[PDB]
Amino acid sequence: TNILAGAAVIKVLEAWGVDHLYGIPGGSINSIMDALSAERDRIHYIQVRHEEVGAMAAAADAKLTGKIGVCFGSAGPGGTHLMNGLYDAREDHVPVLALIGQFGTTGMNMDTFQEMNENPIYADVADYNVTAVNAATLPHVIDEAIRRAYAHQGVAVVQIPVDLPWQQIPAEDWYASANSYQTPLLPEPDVQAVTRLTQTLLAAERPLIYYGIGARKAGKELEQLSKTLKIPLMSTYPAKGIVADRYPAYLGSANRVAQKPANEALAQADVVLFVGNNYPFAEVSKAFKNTRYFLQIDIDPAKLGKRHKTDIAVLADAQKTLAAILAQVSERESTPWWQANLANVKNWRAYLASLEDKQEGPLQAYQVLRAVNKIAEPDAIYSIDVGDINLNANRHLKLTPSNRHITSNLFATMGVGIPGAIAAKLNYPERQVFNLAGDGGASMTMQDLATQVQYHLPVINVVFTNCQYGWIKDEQEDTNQNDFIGVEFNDIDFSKIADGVHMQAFRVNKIEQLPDVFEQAKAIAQHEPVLIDAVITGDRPLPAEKLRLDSAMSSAADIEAFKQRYEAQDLQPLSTYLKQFGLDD
Amino acid sequence: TNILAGAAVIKVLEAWGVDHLYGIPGGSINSIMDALSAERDRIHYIQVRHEEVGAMAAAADAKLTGKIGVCFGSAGPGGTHLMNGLYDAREDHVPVLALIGQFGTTGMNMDTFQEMNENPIYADVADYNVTAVNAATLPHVIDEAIRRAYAHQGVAVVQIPVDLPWQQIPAEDWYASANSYQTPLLPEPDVQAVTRLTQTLLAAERPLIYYGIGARKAGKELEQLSKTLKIPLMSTYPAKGIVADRYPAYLGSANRVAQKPANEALAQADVVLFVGNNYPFAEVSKAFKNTRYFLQIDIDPAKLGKRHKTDIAVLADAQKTLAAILAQVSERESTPWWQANLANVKNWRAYLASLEDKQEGPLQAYQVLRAVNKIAEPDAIYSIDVGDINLNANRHLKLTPSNRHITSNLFATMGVGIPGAIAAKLNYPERQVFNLAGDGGASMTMQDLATQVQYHLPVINVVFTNCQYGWIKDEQEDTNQNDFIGVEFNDIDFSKIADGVHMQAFRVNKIEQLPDVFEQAKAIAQHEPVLIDAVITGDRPLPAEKLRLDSAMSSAADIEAFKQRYEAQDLQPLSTYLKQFGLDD
Amino acid sequence: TNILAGAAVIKVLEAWGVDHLYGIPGGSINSIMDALSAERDRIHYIQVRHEEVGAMAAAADAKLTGKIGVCFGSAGPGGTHLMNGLYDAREDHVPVLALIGQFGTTGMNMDTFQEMNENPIYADVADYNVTAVNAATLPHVIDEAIRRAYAHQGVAVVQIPVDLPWQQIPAEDWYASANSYQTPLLPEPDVQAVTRLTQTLLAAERPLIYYGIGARKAGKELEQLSKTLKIPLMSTYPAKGIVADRYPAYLGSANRVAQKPANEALAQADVVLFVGNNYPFAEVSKAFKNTRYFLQIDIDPAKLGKRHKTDIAVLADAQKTLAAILAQVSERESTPWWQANLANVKNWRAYLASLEDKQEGPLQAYQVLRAVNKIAEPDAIYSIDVGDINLNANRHLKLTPSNRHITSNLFATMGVGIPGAIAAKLNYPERQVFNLAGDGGASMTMQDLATQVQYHLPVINVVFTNCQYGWIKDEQEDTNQNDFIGVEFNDIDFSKIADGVHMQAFRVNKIEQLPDVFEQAKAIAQHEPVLIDAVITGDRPLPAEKLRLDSAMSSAADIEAFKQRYEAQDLQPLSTYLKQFGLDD
Ligand SMILES: Cc1cc2nc3c(=O)[nH]c(=O)nc-3n(C[C@H](O)[C@H](O)[C@H](O)COP(=O)(O)OP(=O)(O)OC[C@H]3O[C@@H](n4cnc5c(N)ncnc54)[C@H](O)[C@@H]3O)c2cc1C
Ligand SMILES: Cc1cc2nc3c(=O)[nH]c(=O)nc-3n(C[C@H](O)[C@H](O)[C@H](O)COP(=O)(O)OP(=O)(O)OC[C@H]3O[C@@H](n4cnc5c(N)ncnc54)[C@H](O)[C@@H]3O)c2cc1C
Ligand SMILES: Cc1cc2nc3c(=O)[nH]c(=O)nc-3n(C[C@H](O)[C@H](O)[C@H](O)COP(=O)(O)OP(=O)(O)OC[C@H]3O[C@@H](n4cnc5c(N)ncnc54)[C@H](O)[C@@H]3O)c2cc1C
Ligand SMILES: Cc1ncc(C[n+]2c([C@@](C)(O)C(=O)O)sc(CCOP(=O)(O)OP(=O)(O)O)c2C)c(N)n1
Ligand SMILES: Cc1ncc(C[n+]2c([C@@](C)(O)C(=O)O)sc(CCOP(=O)(O)OP(=O)(O)O)c2C)c(N)n1
Ligand SMILES: Cc1ncc(C[n+]2c([C@@](C)(O)C(=O)O)sc(CCOP(=O)(O)OP(=O)(O)O)c2C)c(N)n1
Ligand SMILES: [Mg+2]
Ligand SMILES: [Mg+2]
Ligand SMILES: [Mg+2]
Ligand code: NA
């Protein structure tokens, strides 16, 4: 006959298949809390220790599963705490619903306690941003919010006056539209455009295929096209793992979270096939200034010819289009361009392996990641924070299509390691989950290590303790006239932090310590979370964007200094391999 | 070697195929003006007399052609005057680019003359909203604005500090992505879903097909499905004309800008096929409260199950899906439901004809519209203002797929009549164009009758002068307890207004005056604009949402009063026709 | 026992002393209309023909009387039409309450007709910006809005769902805080600071007192300080009339809406007393680049040292501080600086008189303004539009403390002439009221000439018809490389426009026609509005910011061209007068 409006709201969430949601209660959201409390069997409330972690974990849920993440915050400070997670969801274009507490409608606009007009707070971040003002339409407003968040791939925010969810509404009127939800059936890729794009790619002397995460369903086709046509592959950083890292012609990514071969090869390429890619450094880094023909495949019209003047842009699904290309091409014999890139990749991997394979001495980030590799299951998920770890994990993690890795790709909020791992373990209780975080990032969300303990989420946390914002210190080295500032700080012993939240932990500062500590951690994480605090050196990782290796481009003194600093004595510039196989710059 | 950034910006507009744009100059936008001035042979600046008319005409350009409309306003009050046209573009989801003047970067944030932070002004209306801060990237920002406005079917606003377009930039770096433009992919109907939909539709006892402008490409399929299956058709008001008005099973539209047979049939229907339709009155009017099964076809996932819980929902193009249904059905015999509706339509149309066919006496809106019909070419375009005219034009205009009509569908801003006709005549100089406007709406944008004169745009302007806001008077009649207020006002003689802007004009107040005046207007408008000021009675048009004709539902006295007031003695309720064919109400 | 919330809201407006308010009704605001209708004996609704005129008139009410202006617009386009008047109120810092219609709370967030989240629309313009959600608190929210608009000298906006004002609330709980209202405290000048200020001012070789409207209560003190100390006076344009224009050491205003002696003297001054002044051109025009000492008196701490570094700054009321200075000084002898400026003023005024005193020939703006002077009562009020008219009225109107004049000072929105005069005549039915407007600005709000007729408001409207946006043509002349664009347009005959709204009118195009036409207008306006359409030449008024008269600074040829164009053969540069009295430039 009647149902509480709050109970109907929870039933809307359940209809859309929301498994878990995050937040911290307050008087202004206690009626939504009351409805969740009656529904503990069907929907799992996760009490976090800071609301930003709830918002970042909701974004991560959607990154991992493609299903909407849900978080909430009480009126005022609860909701404003969500912001770093909500901006992450907006910039990484994933569906998130955020519920915001509000004072009851009888007290709104009275300038009462923690009471303000909350609608303008969320106007910028949100695709949909409304204050509910009626109980009977509240389930519809929640359903609308969800449907829009999915359709528009972003954040829907609903401010809820706390009186509304306690009002009775007719039991028979409300519904959810989850039952209507589907994905579109697309026509086949434009045949004549695909044929023309293929001819241009094949006519090139120095082709590259450069994909981003829009190509996530197309790993098989990418690797087969590469092998068949003898065309090296490079990707955006987040697209690492779509093609296995072990693939001999995967060059890595460009710019700074980057690998030497991709940077060098891109500078030489005459034709680039840019697929499912919205690389934000295209223009500012002049990435394609030497490219003769630029070909694109993207599913979004707003991206067509966005990043560079484009000769042919096909509006289509990446996988369907790459399959259609593969269907019209056949074997090409090895070329000097292919052989030069393969040799360059081999030389680069030997460099990385030399860093990883040190067996004793002062601990560096490189041996830490090798120790991760050694205990990693083939389908492990990595939640990665923001800083040098993106660069180091990008180079050292050995990923395949069976893995997932997530970070804050574009907003790049520090603190995401812990919440992304919480979300990963909640969605995939049977998969191994790592949190790889620098000390600056880990410290911003450290309190929510307690959330892993409280919910028995067996995350393997690895904190990279350099006592620096290393990423920023290296930037200051490059740009700043005056001394380093704000980038070197006091130690925090995260093994003691972990102990304080009742999580087993280790602290290591020597390479020879790694094998046994990581073996213990692997075993602990069969049942409980664990943390390893790795005390690492302040060595700057090799800057792929500032290579000094080529005699024709850099002075002998600069090359000598670069080789010394970066332990890079055995690295050769691409030009050495180009010359070897009969090509010039 | 170099080009002025302003010249490059105009070249971007040209590459995107912008033929004409609107605005009023100011110091804060004179560098864009300077670039326009050099380009006057390739792109055509239309100087309006109020910037809202420029924004409304830009919206109407896009409604009519699907090509982005372009407008501008100077810093401060120029831009703020755009708002009603920009909101019209957002709510009617058509692409519009708005350029806003701003003080030079050397004077921004100094609190100088007409200088303010302009970005927050446009944040709500705009899909994309940026202040340009660099000359070299300015062409890209404009390119970005256009590509987004198209992809997202909405408003892009760029605030341009006046110094930037007078700066030299490299001639060879800037580009437009117009060459890469594509319209969004059209998703295909799932065959099994279409089969299930077809079976539910065929099993219905009282089916209706209820379409909106999303079905504008599917008029043939809608009419053929209706004839073949013996299923009546109804539409949203804006979808009038997709199927010819003369089609005998076209019921009209529901709610208030509505036709009696559509409201009556919808209340009785057991199954609705809701296609390309976002009827905003669905929930508030409880349109579908007694509908057993609800079948939806829409291209936009945000719409699926939005207006009612769906039994079958198809995420696909309207014409593809309707063709798929038509392909799997064959001729059905007549049914009681079908005959009942056909008879109801005949009775209704005879009513409207009786109004139109009066030959002498006090002029009413009905005969004015008959006089429009009599001079209207088969492919005439109608720009319609907001008020009683929407209801009257909806009932009386005899439209076919060959016509176009536009109004402000959802924001419903008064004043659009004049600008929409300006845009119509610019886009279709060889087609007859009407502006049909009430006196309230015509008053709001009356100065831009001067723009039709200045640009020699032969619009036939027809003003319905009731000396009222009739639409609002009728609402106050229905809801207010106290006397009418603000709805009856002083006469404006629009023939004298027209004389003042140097436009030929006539004023009529008797039915017998119409044939000769309209013939003269038809002739004048072969070369120049003309205005007819029609002084009409204050008769209220029949409220299709408040019918008093059925003695099972209304008192004898209310029926009698309704018949007398609305000259509706010969109208019968649908129940009469339902009973004739053996169906109960 | 109970009262309708809408009735209580109107009672709040009455308690606050609101005599009249403006707007246009709509369904979304009909419950406020219903309450107004019952209260028509105590509060007076003015129905305008476009809501921007209602907002601009509300702003002008507050400019004229200091009492909050009140306007409203229906949901969506009604409210958005308010924007230019609301921005005018914000930038001119006057209290205005705007009520915005909204759909009932049962239909909000359902995406129904003309229904949207309206709160973000007003967030930028408004000091206070809330959507009401409860009937019982609605009177308080309106009370809060008014008290804030006053205290903060800005715009308060309340969006009101239409259901709320038709709800019953307890008769005894609501109140207005009008009874508790007070204006902000007037801070007192520090005696030692005033002494230091006085000594710096007296030690100056070339002193100026430069005041704005913050000194509107201190005209007597300004004129007496000037006479006693032999210090010339200059003002912002809006501060014209605070000291009678006939005062022989009044230099006028600087920059462009400016008088030659003010620009010349300011460039030479060593000490400026800057009082009640927020001149927005100070930094951008480098007004004070050669000023040795800068002395400031202002009531607002946000202004102190804003426009230039301060040597002495006094946070105090202008009149109290000026009286304190005057109290500690005595008569000073004449100085070379004083005589030089007095002679410069005489030469300038003889120039303006030579323009005014033409008796026959092609009509220019100058003689029109002389004709206004000749029929103007000593306490006439001038509502001035935006464009050349600001410059011309600034030079030619002969104002005293008995006059008022208003325009849009800082937002500078065109169209204010008509509404400002409507507001003037409502507030001062016994005072003569002029609307002085260019053709561009008069065009924008021309429909509301009907409002002067409807309410029998005997405004003397004077339109300056140059068939140009003259102000902008002159800017393009100064800055643009290519031909003029968008600044010359087609004639509108405003006497025919006037005839169309049933207002008596005249059109003149010769100097000799003025005396009789203006005498007739003076007489007509004893009882009814009247319009004079003055067809004027396209002569550019003398640019006080681009003087070419001094042979030490300009070529002989530029001087000759300047004299001929501006009929300025008898003008001398200030250096002539400086040299006469033994001072060098
Ligand atoms: C500290 C830090 C530093 C970083 N620096 C770098 C760096 O140096 N190098 C680097 O590479 N990255 C770097 N990034 C990541 C970077 O900011 C961008 O997020 C990333 O490069 C963009 O990757 P993308 O194009 O794969 O993803 P997105 O930006 O999400 O783009 C996806 C694209 O694919 C399209 N798409 C989606 N689905 C389909 C489909 N089915 N078919 C076709 N197209 C589809 C979309 O329309 C879009 O254009 C860094 C991140 C961090 C945290
Ligand atoms: C004064 C006034 C009063 C009004 N009152 C009424 C009234 O009483 N009755 C009335 O009917 N209207 C009325 N309106 C118009 C009304 O507000 C709505 O705008 C209208 O009913 C919605 O029409 P629609 O669904 O055709 O258009 P839209 O709202 O534009 O929706 C079109 C739909 O089609 C979908 N679509 C687009 N392309 C495709 C495709 N290729 N295939 C499938 N789907 C597609 C879109 O996703 C969208 O859902 C009034 C207007 C005015 C000015
Ligand atoms: C088309 C056009 C062009 C214009 N160009 C010019 C131009 O060339 N030249 C020009 O002069 N103007 C021009 N303006 C007007 C200009 O934009 C500014 O509005 C004006 O110069 C500022 O005047 P003001 O300082 O008197 O007023 P405001 O900006 O309102 O400032 C008043 C000051 O007085 C202070 N105050 C208030 N009360 C007191 C008190 N009791 N005691 C002490 N201080 C107090 C306030 O805090 C404030 O600082 C133009 C206007 C238009 C429409
Ligand atoms: C919340 C927050 N605060 C600051 C930053 C800036 N910021 C970064 C970037 C990528 O945005 C950047 O500026 O280049 S990276 C970074 C340092 C990360 O320090 P960590 O100790 O976590 O990582 P290491 O680099 O391994 O030392 C900071 C502070 C950020 N990204 N997020
Ligand atoms: C710019 C503006 N201002 C006010 C309105 C409100 N409004 C209308 C609706 C549909 O929005 C409504 O409220 O129902 S309809 C309307 C009256 C239009 O009066 P007209 O004289 O033009 O038409 P008639 O109804 O033929 O008299 C007004 C003022 C509006 N739509 N746009
Ligand atoms: C609503 C609106 N639109 C445009 C403008 C720009 N604008 C002006 C300024 C002061 O803002 C300026 O840019 O310098 S002045 C101006 C011209 C006014 O032309 P008129 O015909 O009314 O006056 P004359 O100068 O006498 O011809 C315009 C269009 C403006 N102020 N307000
Ligand atoms: Mg660190
Ligand atoms: Mg009317
Ligand atoms: Mg003019
Ligand atoms: Na107007």
* Phi, psi (deg, nearest 5) at residue C211: -115, 155
Q: In a 3-state reduction of DSSP, which class is residue B128?
A: strand
Interchain CB distance below 8 Å, B487 and C411: no
Instruction: Choose which residue among C63, C186, C236, C464 to substitute to test ligand 3 binding: the one with the highest number of ligand atoms within 8 A of its C-beta.
Output: C236
Breaks (C-N over 2.5 A) in chain B follow: none
Beta bridge partners of B272: B208, B294
Q: Whose CA is nearest to atom 24 of ligand 2?
A: B212
Q: For B130-151, give one letter per residue: b (16+ CB within 10 A) or e.
A: bbbeebebbbbbbbbbbbbbbb
Long-range (24+ apart) CB contacts under 8 A made by C549-558 are: C549/C573, C550/C575, C550/C585, C552/C585
Interchain CB distance below 8 Å, B115 and C469: no
- Other C-beta atoms lying within 10 Å of the C-beta of residue B55: 32
Ligand 4 binding pocket includes A469 (Cβ within 6 Å): yes
Considering only the beta carbons, identify the residue of A181, A283, A296 that sits closest to B304: A181
Chains that touch A (3 or more CB pairs under 8 A): B, C
CA-nearest residue to A297 within chain B is B180
Considering only the beta carbons, identify the residue of B187, B296, B305 that sits closest to A184: B187
Question: If you ran DSSP here, which 8-state letter would residue C27 be given?
Answer: G
Ligand 1 binding pocket includes A388 (Cβ within 6 Å): no
Q: How far is CA B343 from the centre of its chain?
A: 30
- Is residue A465 within 8 Å of A534, Cβ to Cβ? yes
- Can you tell me the distance from the alpha carbon of B379 to that of B377, in angstroms, rounded to the nearest whole number? 6
> B137, B138, B153, B182: which to substitute to probe chain A, counting the most A Cβ within 10 Å?
B182
CA-nearest residue to A124 within chain B is B123
Ligand 2 binding pocket includes B472 (Cβ within 6 Å): no
CA-nearest residue to B146 within chain A is A302
H or E, element range at C534: strand C530-535
- Other C-beta atoms lying within 10 Å of the C-beta of residue A513: 19
Residue holding tokens 């052609």? Answer: B65
Q: β-pairing, A207-211 with A233-235?
A: parallel
Interchain CB distance below 8 Å, C112 and B37: no
Ligand 6 binding pocket includes B27 (Cβ within 6 Å): yes
* Phi, psi (deg, nearest 5) at residue B161: -55, 130
B361 exposure class (CB count in 10 Å sphere: 0-12, 13-18, 19+) = exposed
Ligand 3 binding pocket includes C253 (Cβ within 6 Å): yes
Instruction: Choose which residue among A255, A395, A468, A472 to substitute to test ligand 4 binding: the one with the highest number of ligand atoms within 8 A of its C-beta.
Output: A472
Interchain CB distance below 8 Å, B496 and C500: yes
Ligand 6 binding pocket includes C469 (Cβ within 6 Å): yes
Interchain CB distance below 8 Å, C110 and A137: yes
CB proximity list for B302: less than 8 A, separation 6 or greater: A147, A148, A151, A152
Radius of gyration in angstroms for the set of CA atoms belonging to chain B, rounded to a whole number: 26
Angle (CA) B322-B327-B328 rounded to 5° is 105
Method: X-ray
Structural domains present in chain A: 1-184 (3.40.50.970), 185-351 (3.40.50.1220), 352-541 (3.40.50.970)
- Can you tell me the distance from the alpha carbon of B212 to that of B236, in angstroms, rounded to the nearest whole number? 5
Ligand 2 binding pocket includes B410 (Cβ within 6 Å): yes
Q: Please report residues of B whose CB lies closer than 8 A to that of A283.
A: 140
* Phi, psi (deg, nearest 5) at residue B419: -60, -40
Beta bridge partners of A558: none
Question: Could you tell me the maximum CA-CA distance found in chain C, to the nearest angstrom?
Answer: 85
**Which residue numbers of A have CB closer than 8 Å to B's CBs?**
123-124, 140, 143-144, 147-148, 150-152, 175, 177, 179-187, 283, 296, 299-302, 304-306, 309-310, 313, 315-316
- Can you tell me the distance from the alpha carbon of B327 to that of B420, in angstroms, rounded to the nearest whole number? 39
Q: Which ligand is nearest to the CA of A470?
A: 4
Half-sphere exposure of A564 (CA within 13 A, CB side): 6
Between the CA of B84 and the centroid of ligand 5 the distance, in Å, is 14
Q: What is the dihedral of CA B543, B547, B548, B551, to 10 degrees?
A: 170
Between the CA of A439 and the centroid of ligand 4 the distance, in Å, is 10
* Phi, psi (deg, nearest 5) at residue A51: -65, -25
Q: β-pairing, A312-315 with A2-4?
A: unpaired
User: For residue B374, what are the CA distances in angstroms to A286, B394, B465?
Assistant: 63, 16, 20
Chains that touch C (3 or more CB pairs under 8 A): A, B
User: For residue C487, what are the CA distances in angstroms to B18, B27, C69, C464, C572?
Assistant: 22, 11, 34, 15, 32
Q: Which ligand is nearest to the CA of A285?
A: 1
Instruction: Choose which residue among B221, B257, B320, B322 to substitute to test ligand 2 binding: the one with the highest number of ligand atoms within 8 A of its C-beta.
Output: B257
- Nearest-CA distance B81 → chain C (Å): 7
- Can you tell me the distance from the alpha carbon of A439 to that of B17, in angstroms, rounded to the nearest whole number? 53
Between the CA of B24 and the centroid of ligand 6 the distance, in Å, is 9
Residue holding tokens 């009282």? Answer: B206
- Can you tell me the distance from the alpha carbon of B126 to that of B98, in angstroms, rounded to the nearest whole number? 10
Between the CA of B142 and the centroid of ligand 1 the distance, in Å, is 23
Beta bridge partners of C275: C211, C297
Considering only the beta carbons, identify the residue of C110, C119, C136 that sits closest to A117: C119
- Can you tell me the distance from the alpha carbon of C505 to that of B444, in angstroms, rounded to the nearest whole number? 22
- Can you tell me the distance from the alpha carbon of B180 to that of A304, in angstroms, rounded to the nearest whole number? 6
What 3 state SS string does C53-118 have?
A: HHHHHHHHHHHHHCCCEEEEECCCHHHHCCHHHHHHHHHCCCCEEEEEEECCCCCCCCCCCCCCCC
Chains that touch B (3 or more CB pairs under 8 A): A, C
* Phi, psi (deg, nearest 5) at residue A190: -50, 110
Considering only the beta carbons, identify the residue of C24, C77, C87 that sits closest to B76: C87
Considering only the beta carbons, identify the residue of B411, B487, B494 that sits closest to C25: B487
| AA identity, residue B158 | V
Q: Please report residues of C whose CB lies closer than 8 A to that of A123.
A: 120, 123
Please list the alpha-helical segments (H only) found in A488-568.
Answer: 494-500, 514-524, 556-565
Binding site per annotation, positions of A for Mg(2+): 439, 466, 468
Q: In a 3-state reduction of DSSP, which class is residue C320?
A: helix
What 3 state SS string does B169-229 have?
A: EECCCCCCCHHHCCCCCCCECCHHHHHHHHHHHHHCCCEEEEECHHHCCCHHHHHHHHHHH
- Can you tell me the distance from the alpha carbon of A513 to that of C167, in angstroms, rounded to the nearest whole number? 75
Ligand 1 binding pocket includes A298 (Cβ within 6 Å): yes
* Helix, strand, coil content of chain B in percent (nearest 5): 40, 15, 40
Residue holding tokens 């001067």? Answer: B450
H or E, element range at B124: none
- Can you tell me the distance from the alpha carbon of C475 to that of C391, in angstroms, rounded to the nearest whole number? 14
- Can you tell me the distance from the alpha carbon of A212 to that of A275, in angstroms, rounded to the nearest whole number? 6
Q: How far is CA A462 from the centre of its chain?
A: 17
Q: Whose CA is nearest to atom 8 of ligand 4?
A: A387
Residue B30 marked as a ligand binder:
no
Half-sphere exposure of A80 (CA within 13 A, CB side): 9
Angle (CA) A458-A461-A463 rounded to 5° is 170
- Can you tell me the distance from the alpha carbon of B176 to that of A380, in angstroms, rounded to the nearest whole number? 44
Ligand 3 binding pocket includes B113 (Cβ within 6 Å): yes
Sheet containing strand A69-73, strands side by side: A44-47, A20-23, A69-73, A96-102, A155-161, A128-131
CB proximity list for A136: less than 8 A, separation 6 or greater: A5, A169, A170, A173, A174, C106
Residue B466 marked as a ligand binder:
yes
Q: What is the dihedral of CA B363, B369, B370, B375, to 10 degrees?
A: 120
Residue whose C-alpha is closest to residue B71's, from B156, B133, B11? B156
Residue whose C-alpha is closest to residue B284's, from A146, C29, C109? C109
- Can you tell me the distance from the alpha carbon of A112 to that of A27, in angstroms, rounded to the nearest whole number? 13
